[PDB]
């Protein structure tokens, strides 16, 4: 006797990723990761995020993409231990998603270089980039 | 059409739609629908209970969407939900002004409406810049935005039993 326990994962983080890419508003995708009562999860968006990079084709994904990141770091939103662990999974995702011959060594050294420049991960992440 | 008396009718369906909203009645709202027997006005009931759930939590309007497929059909036609939109949307510039999540979430209602099948699909390219309001617009593009997420997982969100 009630109601349906609430889902999770689904119509979660995709909401995100959506938003932005259609509207692209950043109050619009802070206000929803304010949302979660859980910092430590904010990892999922992260490495998310710049998964979608490599898998769309266009500057408007890199030029609003990274912008989201660095908007949330504008307020303390996303943690450093989650953005390691968000880098940390790209790197093992590189070999399967290039599958021999990563073309896109470009794109992953750019972004993690301007990353970096950025100042929100130390060298310790730059070095685990295959550099 | 111009809804007649239309405070008058607002402060009636205040306890219907608060008493719906406690243990999810479809079947009660029909039966007082009936009892209270509107034209055009009848486009008001879907839209109230739409402005107050989104004063409410978010699990209460989820709950919303079952209403309307629920009055559909029985004592609502679909070309009536069509009219309860419009209505709705020329509200939202209100609203929006004290909840900022507003619009956010009349995009939901209309890409659930779409995607359930009680609302036109081509609702939207109808108003494909049709519109001058921002407002209404954002609703508007949230409805695809939305609509592309649960396309595919249509048939997961409901599988959880522990009630």
């Known amino acids: ?131 | 059409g111009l809804p007649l008396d239309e405070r008058a009718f607002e402060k009636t369906l205040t306890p219907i739609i608060q008493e719906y909203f406690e243990h999810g009645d479809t079947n009660e709202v029909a039966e007082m629908l009936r009892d209270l027997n509107l034209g055009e006005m009848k486009s008001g009931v879907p839209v109230l209970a739409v402005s107050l759930a989104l004063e409410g939590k978010a699990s209460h309007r989820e709950m919303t969407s079952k209403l309307l497929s629920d009055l559909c059909g029985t004592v609502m036609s679909t070309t009536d939900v069509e009219k309860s939109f419009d209505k709705l949307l020329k509200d939202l510039p209100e609203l929006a002004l004290d909840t900022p999540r507003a619009p956010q979430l009349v995009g939901q209602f209309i890409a659930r409406a779409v995607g359930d099948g009680i609302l036109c699909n081509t609702y939207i390219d109808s108003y494909k810049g049709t519109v001058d309001c921002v407002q209404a617009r954002a609703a508007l593009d949230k409805a695809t935005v939305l609509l592309s997420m649960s396309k595919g997982g249509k048939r997961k969100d409901s599988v959880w039993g522990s009630g």
């Open chain 1, 1 to 131: 006797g009630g109601q349906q326990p609430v889902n999770h994962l689904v119509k979660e983080i995709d909401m995100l990723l959506k938003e932005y890419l259609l509207s692209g508003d950043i109050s619009e995708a802070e206000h929803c990761l304010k949302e979660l009562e859980v910092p430590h999860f904010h990892h999922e968006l992260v490495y998310e995020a710049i998964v979608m990079v490599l898998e769309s084709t266009g500057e408007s994904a890199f030029k609003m993409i990274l912008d989201l990141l660095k908007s949330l770091w504008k307020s303390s939103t996303i943690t450093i231990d989650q953005m390691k662990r968000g880098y940390e999974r790209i790197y093992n995702e590189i070999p399967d998603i290039n599958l021999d011959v990563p073309h896109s060594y470009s794109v992953l050294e750019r972004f993690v270089e301007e990353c970096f420049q950025a100042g929100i991960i130390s060298k310790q992440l730059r070095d685990l980039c295959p550099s």
